[PDB]
Amino acid sequence: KKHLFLLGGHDLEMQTIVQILTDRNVIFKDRYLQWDNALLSQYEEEIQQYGNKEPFIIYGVELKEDITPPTNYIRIDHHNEYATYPSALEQVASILDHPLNRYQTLVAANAKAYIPGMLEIGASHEEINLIRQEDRKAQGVIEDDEKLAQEAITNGTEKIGSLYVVFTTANKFSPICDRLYPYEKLLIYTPNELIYYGKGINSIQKILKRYTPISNIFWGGGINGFIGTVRNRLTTNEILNIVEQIKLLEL
Ligand SMILES: Nc1ncnc2c1ncn2[C@@H]1O[C@H](COP(=O)(O)O[C@H]2[C@@H](O)[C@H](n3cnc4c(N)ncnc43)O[C@@H]2CSCC[C@H](N)C(=O)O)[C@@H](O)[C@H]1O
């Protein structure tokens, strides 16, 4: 059985997956997707040529199935109902019988549990710093993202009990997280998007499902994981209402 991999949005894990797939001569297609456009329909041409053809198994790595996948398609993900699963890098390596080296174990740990996941595998201060910078660089974080981050922590950040609430006009939130870490609970929101990081995401999912269908909600990891809403699917008032509901969990 021959392997076809379709890669979704880019980050340090997806970059590492490209490296391993490259070194091992695996058929894979990388349309340089990002976290917000990781659609299976981006690979409609490849689904047409390899879909339902016996010799090939198709591995979609963190792709929303906005089109019906063929019968020879296996979803490779660690989000939503797969949120307790090992990271995509770990699952891809297992399929290829690739032993993850020390660097790649940190890539998987950061992908699944951020900085706590790396401290759990004995990461050093300099190991954590290189992973975080490479992770943000692979996301496309640039200098304008890091400035809006500094302003968001300086001028739009309050703490309610154990919860940081940051209003921002920024596009990428990883710059804010690394400046505020360590934290137990962090809520970043924009006029049409919010992402929660930290303890008790199941209680947050309860709140979100009162305001928007589950198809606008993504999450990953356990408690001390993240849960968020797709950009521009909720109104400003809906976000602001949710922000108050999340704040109410601290009172
Ligand atoms: N507790 C934590 N605190 C801070 N960062 C963490 C934490 N846990 C994990 N992380 C980091 O978060 C990253 C998780 O990576 P992923 O598993 O690929 O998960 C990614 C996406 O794959 C996933 N996602 C699913 N659908 C969508 C969508 N429509 N739009 C945007 N994002 C979507 O949600 C995650 C991004 S969530 C925040 C997105 C934000 N708009 C931004 O630009 O930074 C990874 O780099 C980890 O290091």
Side-chain angles (χ1 to χ4, degrees):
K1 288 254 145 283
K2 271 172 62 86
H3 294 338
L4 169 66
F5 284 82
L6 308 180
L7 305 180
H10 274 248
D11 40 54
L12 192 45
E13 180 185 34
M14 195 65 72
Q15 165 197 146
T16 306
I17 287 172
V18 169
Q19 299 191 294
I20 294 178
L21 292 176
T22 301
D23 295 330
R24 292 285 304 285
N25 314 321
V26 185
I27 315 180
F28 74 97
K29 280 306 306 294
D30 175 54
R31 273 158 57 86
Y32 323 107
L33 307 176
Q34 287 158 302
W35 275 345
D36 60 24
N37 66 10
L39 302 176
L40 179 57
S41 68
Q42 300 271 14
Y43 297 116
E44 230 165 72
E45 177 141 312
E46 295 80 357
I47 288 305
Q48 166 273 324
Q49 35 201 89
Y50 300 85
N52 288 316
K53 269 196 201 204
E54 200 161 8
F56 295 85
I57 293 179
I58 309 172
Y59 287 115
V61 191
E62 300 184 63
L63 287 168
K64 163 161 152 204
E65 285 136 29
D66 59 329
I67 60 173
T68 287
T71 61
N72 60 333
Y73 180 93
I74 292 176
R75 162 185 178 187
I76 300 301
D77 198 29
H78 50 260
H79 298 144
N80 292 32
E81 268 77 59
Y82 296 19
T84 37
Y85 283 12
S87 71
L89 165 64
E90 289 161 314
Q91 297 188 230
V92 168
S94 190
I95 295 172
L96 308 171
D97 285 327
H98 171 84
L100 298 172
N101 62 39
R102 176 53 183 181
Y103 170 76
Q104 295 161 346
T105 63
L106 293 161
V107 180
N110 174 78
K112 178 208 175 66
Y114 186 52
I115 301 184
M118 284 191 283
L119 289 168
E120 217 161 0
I121 64 180
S124 76
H125 173 70
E126 31 272 58
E127 293 179 318
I128 288 165
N129 281 162
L130 212 81
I131 292 292
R132 289 313 307 155
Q133 281 169 35
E134 284 300 323
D135 202 3
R136 297 190 304 265
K137 179 152 137 286
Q139 298 166 22
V141 171
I142 49 173
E143 172 175 312
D144 253 340
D145 292 318
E146 296 271 70
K147 269 154 195 189
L148 263 169
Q150 181 55 44
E151 273 270 339
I153 287 110
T154 303
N155 313 307
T157 295
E158 70 160 354
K159 181 171 183 183
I160 306 91
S162 66
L163 167 69
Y164 284 109
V165 181
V166 186
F167 178 68
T168 188
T169 64
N171 195 73
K172 327 202 94 152
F173 295 170
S174 57
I176 300 175
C177 296
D178 291 343
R179 284 163 170 79
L180 281 175
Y181 201 73
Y183 51 77
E184 293 155 13
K185 299 172 166 184
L186 165 64
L187 175 60
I188 306 179
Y189 72 109
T190 70
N192 293 108
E193 175 188 26
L194 75 97
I195 308 287
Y196 178 91
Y197 308 88
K199 309 290 176 75
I201 58 176
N202 252 332
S203 57
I204 314 299
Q205 182 179 353
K206 167 86 189 78
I207 295 175
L208 294 175
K209 284 162 99 163
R210 293 197 293 266
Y211 294 82
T212 195
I214 192 73
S215 59
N216 299 336
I217 301 165
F218 52 85
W219 66 100
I223 278 197
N224 188 252
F226 60 95
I227 181 156
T229 65
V230 181
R231 194 191 320 254
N232 302 126
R233 302 289 174 81
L234 284 64
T235 70
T236 297
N237 217 72
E238 285 174 357
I239 302 291
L240 295 170
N241 279 329
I242 292 164
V243 164
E244 282 300 341
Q245 290 288 328
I246 292 173
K247 288 201 267 201
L248 283 165
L249 293 177
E250 303 298 312
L251 307 179

